[PDB]
């Protein structure tokens, strides 16, 4: 690198290489992705250099979109841990009930914000949401998907994991809709409140079909159109739905009920970020500080 002096290699991201580095100009420290091929779309360039400009403090801010060598580096706002790793370490104990509202909470926000500027994230999942030591939780990575491309396998061929996909998407729907956002963050609502992921699918179609076996199989009745998407099939097996007391106990009937608005099948029908911030469950959030140990 030119005016960075790489730290420590945070990962081996979905786009590429990321490391912590620290500005030797400005002593700033930050989080650099360098991005994949042989010569980078200008279309991306735009689109990227557009998220510049969406700036909110539950989104990770975008510092700069560098273009050379064939290589793309996007310098970002640098936070110490991510909700997968923080998950993991409160795996025994579980995340407190008052901070996963908190985060809900604030991760809605930071759609709601996005959304109302015409930005979808579409690959929400909890290595994406990054937290400080002051309570805060911020998206990563919002817009890259419709600046890049799609994901499959990480430039280390690590695979991609579908456990937040909206089922629109695993149906082959051609266009997103902001809902897919809305469903990926009930299925990390639901994980943090049970301590396992709630549809962890290691294929496509496992991922659909765990989806069905606890939302039971949609139909015309509850999804309109459903039996006329691209990947549809009438040999779809039929599953009853479960209820949500069994689904992600022991969380209260207001949680149940906000989660059960963000996982409706119909995309039209699935609750907004705007309306989830007004949910009942909300009534008594505060912004309590998680227990960091960097
Ligand atoms: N902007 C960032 O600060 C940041 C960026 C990415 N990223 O660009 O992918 C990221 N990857 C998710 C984990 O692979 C994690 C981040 N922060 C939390 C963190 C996690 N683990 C370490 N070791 N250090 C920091």
């Not at 042989?38 to 909110?56: C, D, F, Q, Y």
């Not at 009745?221 to 689904?247: C, E, H, I, L, N």
Request: some cysteine; charged content about 25%.
């Amino acid at each position: 690198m030119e005016n960075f002096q790489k730290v420590e290699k945070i990962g081996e991201g979905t786009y590429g290489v990321v490391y912590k580095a620290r500005n030797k100009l400005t002593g700033e420290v930050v989080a650099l992705k360098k991005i994949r091929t042989e010569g980078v779309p200008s279309t991306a360039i735009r689109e990227i250099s557009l998220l510049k400009e969406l700036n909110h403090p539950n989104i990770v801010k975008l510092l700069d979109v560098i273009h050379t060598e064939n290589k793309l580096y996007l310098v970002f706002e640098f936070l110490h841990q991510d909700l997968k790793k923080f998950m993991d370490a409160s795996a025994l104990t579980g995340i407190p009930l008052p901070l996963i509202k908190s985060y809900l909470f604030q991760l809605l926000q930071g759609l709601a914000f996005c959304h109302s500027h015409r930005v979808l994230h579409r690959d929400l999942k909890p290595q994406n949401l990054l937290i400080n030591t002051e309570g805060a939780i911020k998206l990563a990575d919002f817009g890259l998907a419709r600046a890049f491309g799609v994901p499959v396998r990480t430039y280390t061929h690590e695979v991609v994991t579908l456990w937040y996909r909206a089922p629109e998407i695993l149906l082959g729907c051609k266009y997103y809709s902001t809902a897919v956002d809305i469903w990926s963050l009930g299925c990390i609502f639901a994980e943090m409140v049970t301590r396992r992921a709630l549809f962890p699918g290691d294929s496509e179609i496992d991922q659909l079909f765990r989806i069905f076996r606890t939302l039971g199989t949609p139909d015309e009745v509850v999804w309109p159109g459903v039996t006329s998407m691209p990947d549809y099939k009438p040999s779809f097996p039929k599953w009853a739905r479960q209820d949500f007391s069994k689904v992600v106990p022991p969380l209260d009937e207001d949680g149940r009920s906000l989660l059960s608005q963000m996982l409706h099948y119909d995309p039209n029908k699935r609750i907004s970020a705007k309306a989830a911030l007004a949910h009942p469950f909300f009534q008594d959030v505060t912004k309590p500080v998680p227990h960091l140990r960097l």
